[PDB]
Scaffold this motif. Sequence first.
Motif, PDB file in Angstrom:
ATOM      1  N   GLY A  98      22.712  71.920  66.913  1.00 53.06           N
ATOM      2  CA  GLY A  98      21.732  71.607  68.012  1.00 53.06           C
ATOM      3  C   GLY A  98      20.947  70.662  67.499  1.00 53.06           C
ATOM      4  N   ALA A  99      20.860  69.666  66.746  1.00 47.87           N
ATOM      5  CA  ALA A  99      20.195  69.069  66.715  1.00 47.87           C
ATOM      6  C   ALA A  99      20.514  67.656  67.309  1.00 47.87           C
ATOM      7  CB  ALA A  99      19.393  68.426  65.201  1.00 47.87           C
ATOM      8  N   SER A 100      19.006  67.362  67.892  1.00 53.45           N
ATOM      9  CA  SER A 100      18.548  66.296  68.346  1.00 53.45           C
ATOM     10  C   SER A 100      17.817  65.022  67.463  1.00 53.45           C
ATOM     11  CB  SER A 100      18.450  65.982  69.637  1.00 53.45           C
ATOM     12  OG  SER A 100      17.725  64.419  69.716  1.00 53.45           O
ATOM     13  N   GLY A 101      19.373  63.982  66.318  1.00 51.98           N
ATOM     14  CA  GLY A 101      18.171  63.196  65.643  1.00 51.98           C
ATOM     15  C   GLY A 101      17.675  63.856  64.527  1.00 51.98           C
ATOM     16  N   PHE A 102      17.135  63.008  63.557  1.00 54.30           N
ATOM     17  CA  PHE A 102      16.639  63.456  62.408  1.00 54.30           C
ATOM     18  C   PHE A 102      15.567  62.665  62.074  1.00 54.30           C
ATOM     19  CE2 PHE A 102      21.482  65.545  61.895  1.00 54.30           C
ATOM     20  CZ  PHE A 102      22.414  64.809  61.866  1.00 54.30           C
ATOM     21  N   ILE A 103      14.983  64.447  60.567  1.00 51.17           N
ATOM     22  CA  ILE A 103      13.402  63.575  60.320  1.00 51.17           C
ATOM     23  C   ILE A 103      14.165  64.006  59.020  1.00 51.17           C
ATOM     24  CG2 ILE A 103      11.002  64.076  60.654  1.00 51.17           C
ATOM     25  CD1 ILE A 103      10.945  64.103  63.551  1.00 51.17           C
ATOM     26  N   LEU A 104      13.495  63.226  58.131  1.00 51.00           N
ATOM     27  CA  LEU A 104      13.501  63.635  57.174  1.00 51.00           C
ATOM     28  C   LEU A 104      11.732  63.426  55.833  1.00 51.00           C
ATOM     29  CD1 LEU A 104      14.979  63.757  54.342  1.00 51.00           C
ATOM     30  CD2 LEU A 104      15.630  61.456  54.445  1.00 51.00           C
ATOM     31  N   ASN A 105      11.644  64.538  54.929  1.00 48.04           N
ATOM     32  CA  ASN A 105      10.566  63.973  54.253  1.00 48.04           C
ATOM     33  C   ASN A 105      11.550  63.372  52.529  1.00 48.04           C
ATOM     34  OD1 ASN A 105       8.704  65.607  55.446  1.00 48.04           O
ATOM     35  ND2 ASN A 105       8.306  66.835  54.520  1.00 48.04           N
ATOM     36  N   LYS A 125       1.438  56.417  55.684  1.00 47.73           N
ATOM     37  CA  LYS A 125       0.727  57.312  55.393  1.00 47.73           C
ATOM     38  C   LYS A 125       1.818  58.726  54.261  1.00 47.73           C
ATOM     39  CE  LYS A 125      -2.741  59.736  53.770  1.00 47.73           C
ATOM     40  NZ  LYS A 125      -2.127  59.456  52.690  1.00 47.73           N
ATOM     41  N   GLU A 126       1.172  58.399  53.249  1.00 48.93           N
ATOM     42  CA  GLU A 126       2.754  59.322  52.338  1.00 48.93           C
ATOM     43  C   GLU A 126       1.466  61.044  51.982  1.00 48.93           C
ATOM     44  OE1 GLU A 126       2.536  57.699  47.807  1.00 48.93           O
ATOM     45  OE2 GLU A 126       3.568  55.237  48.601  1.00 48.93           O
ATOM     46  N   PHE A 127       2.534  61.549  51.468  1.00 51.37           N
ATOM     47  CA  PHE A 127       1.981  63.219  51.756  1.00 51.37           C
ATOM     48  C   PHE A 127       2.750  63.945  50.551  1.00 51.37           C
ATOM     49  CE2 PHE A 127       5.459  63.013  54.049  1.00 51.37           C
ATOM     50  CZ  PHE A 127       6.061  63.509  54.296  1.00 51.37           C
ATOM     51  N   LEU A 128       1.852  65.374  50.085  1.00 48.05           N
ATOM     52  CA  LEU A 128       3.025  66.244  49.158  1.00 48.05           C
ATOM     53  C   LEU A 128       3.020  66.797  50.060  1.00 48.05           C
ATOM     54  CD1 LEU A 128      -0.632  66.613  46.472  1.00 48.05           C
ATOM     55  CD2 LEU A 128       1.566  64.560  46.316  1.00 48.05           C
ATOM     56  N   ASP A 129       4.180  67.404  49.353  1.00 46.40           N
ATOM     57  CA  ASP A 129       4.910  68.278  49.953  1.00 46.40           C
ATOM     58  C   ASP A 129       5.578  69.086  49.885  1.00 46.40           C
ATOM     59  OD1 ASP A 129       7.348  70.139  51.093  1.00 46.40           O
ATOM     60  OD2 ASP A 129       8.506  68.684  51.927  1.00 46.40           O
ATOM     61  N   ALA A 130       5.790  69.589  47.868  1.00 43.43           N
ATOM     62  CA  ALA A 130       5.969  70.497  47.053  1.00 43.43           C
ATOM     63  C   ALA A 130       4.545  69.952  46.025  1.00 43.43           C
ATOM     64  CB  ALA A 130       6.687  70.650  47.016  1.00 43.43           C
ATOM     65  N   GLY A 131       3.792  69.798  45.762  1.00 46.83           N
ATOM     66  CA  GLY A 131       2.363  68.802  45.092  1.00 46.83           C
ATOM     67  C   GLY A 131       3.222  67.528  45.066  1.00 46.83           C
ATOM     68  N   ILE A 132       4.524  67.263  45.378  1.00 46.65           N
ATOM     69  CA  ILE A 132       5.059  65.656  45.205  1.00 46.65           C
ATOM     70  C   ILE A 132       5.082  64.761  46.224  1.00 46.65           C
ATOM     71  CG2 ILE A 132       7.487  64.801  44.621  1.00 46.65           C
ATOM     72  CD1 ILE A 132       5.924  66.165  42.142  1.00 46.65           C
ATOM     73  N   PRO A 133       4.553  63.131  45.934  1.00 49.77           N
ATOM     74  CA  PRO A 133       4.713  62.156  46.376  1.00 49.77           C
ATOM     75  C   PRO A 133       5.827  61.390  47.551  1.00 49.77           C
ATOM     76  CG  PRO A 133       3.002  61.474  45.106  1.00 49.77           C
ATOM     77  CD  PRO A 133       4.248  63.246  44.203  1.00 49.77           C
ATOM     78  N   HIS A 134       5.434  62.110  48.899  1.00 46.04           N
ATOM     79  CA  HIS A 134       6.682  61.995  49.962  1.00 46.04           C
ATOM     80  C   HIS A 134       6.344  61.151  51.507  1.00 46.04           C
ATOM     81  CE1 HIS A 134       8.417  65.084  48.399  1.00 46.04           C
ATOM     82  NE2 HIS A 134       9.555  65.221  48.844  1.00 46.04           N
ATOM     83  N   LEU A 135       7.367  60.310  51.914  1.00 51.28           N
ATOM     84  CA  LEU A 135       7.465  59.624  53.178  1.00 51.28           C
ATOM     85  C   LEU A 135       8.131  60.263  54.165  1.00 51.28           C
ATOM     86  CD1 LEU A 135       6.966  56.003  51.606  1.00 51.28           C
ATOM     87  CD2 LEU A 135       4.906  56.680  52.843  1.00 51.28           C
ATOM     88  N   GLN A 136       7.687  60.426  55.787  1.00 53.41           N
ATOM     89  CA  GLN A 136       8.461  60.628  56.371  1.00 53.41           C
ATOM     90  C   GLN A 136       9.510  59.462  56.913  1.00 53.41           C
ATOM     91  OE1 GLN A 136       7.133  63.045  59.820  1.00 53.41           O
ATOM     92  NE2 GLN A 136       8.372  64.312  58.910  1.00 53.41           N
ATOM     93  N   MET A 137      10.818  60.026  57.231  1.00 53.73           N
ATOM     94  CA  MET A 137      10.973  58.945  57.885  1.00 53.73           C
ATOM     95  C   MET A 137      12.675  59.440  59.465  1.00 53.73           C
ATOM     96  SD  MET A 137      12.985  57.148  53.896  1.00 53.73           S
ATOM     97  CE  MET A 137      13.246  55.873  54.699  1.00 53.73           C
ATOM     98  N   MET A 138      12.942  58.975  59.491  1.00 51.60           N
ATOM     99  CA  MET A 138      13.483  59.180  61.080  1.00 51.60           C
ATOM    100  C   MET A 138      14.665  58.149  60.870  1.00 51.60           C
ATOM    101  SD  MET A 138      12.997  59.265  65.189  1.00 51.60           S
ATOM    102  CE  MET A 138      11.756  60.808  64.810  1.00 51.60           C
ATOM    103  N   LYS A 139      15.792  59.038  61.723  1.00 48.44           N
ATOM    104  CA  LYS A 139      16.818  58.234  62.076  1.00 48.44           C
ATOM    105  C   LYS A 139      17.909  58.719  63.277  1.00 48.44           C
ATOM    106  CE  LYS A 139      22.289  58.758  60.306  1.00 48.44           C
ATOM    107  NZ  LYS A 139      22.402  59.514  61.403  1.00 48.44           N
ATOM    108  N   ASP A 140      18.234  57.972  63.788  1.00 46.74           N
ATOM    109  CA  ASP A 140      18.240  58.756  65.365  1.00 46.74           C
ATOM    110  C   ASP A 140      19.585  58.871  65.587  1.00 46.74           C
ATOM    111  OD1 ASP A 140      15.812  56.667  67.524  1.00 46.74           O
ATOM    112  OD2 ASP A 140      15.790  57.788  65.757  1.00 46.74           O
TER     113      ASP A 140
END
Length: 140
Positions: A98-105, A125-140
């Motif tokens: 039942g998700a609406s759109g996707f957000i990805l690390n 803006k880059e951020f650490l997820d599990a101590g590792i560099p990530h960027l957040q993305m989206m898909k509609d």
Amino acid sequence: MKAVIAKNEEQLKDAFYVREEVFVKEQNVPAEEEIDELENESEHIVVYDGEKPVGAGRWRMKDGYGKLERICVLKSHRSAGVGGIIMKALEKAAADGGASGFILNAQTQAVPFYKKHGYRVLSEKEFLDAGIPHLQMMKD
């Protein structure tokens, strides 16, 4: 290659073995800093090639969106196409959930790949997820 929703003992053990491989063995993340307090609230997926686990990831519902996280594919199988299989499985499971759109690390270096699958950077803006560099993305 076969994707499966990990629910039992052996399947979940395989999922975390694959995540340990990428975060701990390949990177340098301390032993179990790879596991967080959201594992029981998330649904896990594992990709197998025969009886060998070659990929893993998780998703959970967040503000109406399907949040995809910790997509892990070890070095030995980077050119095996495990990436597209996990992503598609996660999107499918999230949708059915039942998700609406996707957000990805996404790991910073994997951004190009995700753009190939319809994802756009949500923030520079880059951020650490599990101590590792990530960027957040989206898909509609």
